[PDB]
């Protein structure tokens, strides 16, 4: 059956390379298998979610060409659906009210006597998790994982006001959206057994899970905002081209023999879960810089010119001063070859737009400065 993957970010306000890699891989797996890639926004923690955060996710995804086939589906807009499933579960006895790990004191069982519910209390609803046996899956990354159901408990699926809880919302979404493959950070591995049990109890087919190892920073710690990570659009703002960041990130957790340089289309054609790395990958800004230099040489000069404009401003060089100065498109072609970033292009090129206080072939340089400008500057 056709593949259906998803990217289901919680919008907490900051996205680094590690985060957007968890979009890249399910996108690539869907495109490789001619399947569907779904976008879901996990906003049920209203305290730690915002519209700004959502637009930044959409902007980073678009910058990297991670187009999605369905969505964005917002969990906070699916509360009627979640409530409907909870009512069905209660009718079928798959969830029960609790009126106080949890020890199942309020779990109904044939033969067991339950107390009368305390008159003053709105119960929480809990899922009837299996008490015997084990929950196991063949993780595409981690291999066979197996957990005793005795170690799990009867998950709260709804608060006393009836609001559904996070893990339950995930399962309903994965069911409703027909998800076949769940590729996500291994920081979610512990939620997997409880999700599997609910999904199965609801009648679904359990997807294939692939839990990605952490991404490390250059200090060998987990890449994170607190550890000084740059944001995805921070890379753009520092002069990195999207095609470079895409090629770099693809290889930060996945391999295909010796290959290091490849297009998006070739990545899609090659991508496979079997060659996801099984241990953490480590960021290396020198490697990213090499690739960015490579792609800068390859980039169209008029494109580079437009990307360069905000870096010239940062150097006290103005739109008007550029139009009046040497042709920027020609300047880009002449100066880009040594640059690791678009910012460096602009810095190396500022000499064409600054009053004189390092140069390519004298003749090309003179041609781009007008006749009038070269003539006068000599005489003095
Ligand atoms: N919302 C989670 C992903 C959950 C999932 O993929 O099941 C995150 O942002 O890390
Ligand atoms: Cl760490
Ligand atoms: Na000009």
Residue numbers in the entry: 3 to 102, 122 to 378, 444 to 466
Authors' text:
We solved two co-crystal structures of the class Ib GluRS bound to L-glutamic acid, one from B. burgdorferi at 2.6 Å resolution and one from B. thailandensis at 2.05 Å resolution. Several aaRSs from Burkholderia thailandensis were identified as candidate essential genes in a transposon screen. Differences between the two GluRS structures in the cognate amino acid binding pocket are apparent. For example, in the B. thailandensis GluRS structure, His209 makes a hydrogen bond with the main chain carboxylate of the cognate glutamic acid, but a hydrogen bond is not observed from the equivalent Trp residue in the B. burgdorferi structure. In the B. thailandensis GluRS structure several water-mediated interactions were observed in the amino acid binding pocket compared to the B. burgdorferi GluRS structure, presumably due to the higher resolution of the B. thailandensis GluRS structure. The two structures have an RMSD of 1.08 Å and a sequence homology of 34% identical and 53% similar amino acid sequences.
